[PDB]
Amino acid sequence: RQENVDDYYDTGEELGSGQFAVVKKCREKSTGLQYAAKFIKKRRTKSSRRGVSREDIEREVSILKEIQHPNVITLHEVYENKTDVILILELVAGGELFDFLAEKESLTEEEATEFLKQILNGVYYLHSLQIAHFDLKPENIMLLDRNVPKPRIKIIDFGLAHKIDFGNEFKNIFGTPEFVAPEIVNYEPLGLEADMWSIGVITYILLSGASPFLGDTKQETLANVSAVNYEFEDEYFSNTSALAKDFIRRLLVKDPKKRMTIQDSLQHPWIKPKDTQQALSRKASAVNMEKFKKFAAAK
Numbered sequence: 001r002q003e004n005v006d007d008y009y010d011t012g013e014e015l016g017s018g019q020f021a022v023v024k025k026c027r028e029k030s031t032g033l034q035y036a037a038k039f040i041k042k043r044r045t046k047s048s049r050r051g052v053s054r055e056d057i058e059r060e061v062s063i064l065k066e067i068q069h070p071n072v073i074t075l076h077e078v079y080e081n082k083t084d085v086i087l088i089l090e091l092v093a094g095g096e097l098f099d100f101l102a103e104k105e106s107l108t109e110e111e112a113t114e115f116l117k118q119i120l121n122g123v124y125y126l127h128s129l130q131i132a133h134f135d136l137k138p139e140n141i142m143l144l145d146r147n148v149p150k151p152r153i154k155i156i157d158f159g160l161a162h163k164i165d166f167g168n169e170f171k172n173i174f175g176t177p178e179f180v181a182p183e184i185v186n187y188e189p190l191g192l193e194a195d196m197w198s199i200g201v202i203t204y205i206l207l208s209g210a211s212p213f214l215g216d217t218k219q220e221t222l223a224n225v226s227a228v229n230y231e232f233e234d235e236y237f238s239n240t241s242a243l244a245k246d247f248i249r250r251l252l253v254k255d256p257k258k259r260m261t262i263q264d265s266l267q268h269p270w271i272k273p274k275d276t277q278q279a280l281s282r283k284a285s286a287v288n289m290e291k292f293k294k295f296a297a298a299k
Contacts, residue, residue, distance in 0.1 A: 097142065
């Protein structure tokens, strides 16, 4: 693994900052092309509670090395020194999808599905390689460039992603309560299905500007998710099509085995209309933009 990133890159402004990671814009000296450098602090000793373990960093790297698809972030280079592992990643310059959408006058369901379909294709690619993302939520759905007529979705942040191992169950507490599936809430075996639930949550918010399971407390949220306690309130879904509600309903399903898969989501008639009447229902229907704007501004 390569060593001195400063000899190869000019590093610029901070793009964001998480748990034990900071992301800065950078420019490769040899090509003059722009990237995002994700600096991940290594755990210095077994007993330390700052930094990420070797195993967790190498898992993220291994998965990123695999991925090549236009709707998923790509890895350019990896550097490591004594203190950090540095991932040189594709620059995703266009911000979060929801911030972009909240600047529009309106969003028809037809327009909404043009973005949602790109998310579905990115997840389709991942699931086809047996990779679960495990952290799908609005802030991980970004745009490459906000200044083009048809902006391109990029799924980011593979810090929680796992290659499904057929021979061993995977269980773990991770993610944000309002966006995670009942099996995560209940510490049951996890697989590709959890991503499908999160897509359902993302879709519900896209259309209404309301979080389906969010309670006043963490405990209330966990309980709402486990019970699959949600509804389509008239106040929020007054211009929402029956196809759209059916798409969300098929994803927000307690038993992972009964939940819609990624392949079936792409064939659902809200995404791929079978006749002109269905298509016209999607074109005429629209998001609750006044409430959507409020959701985006609040967070």
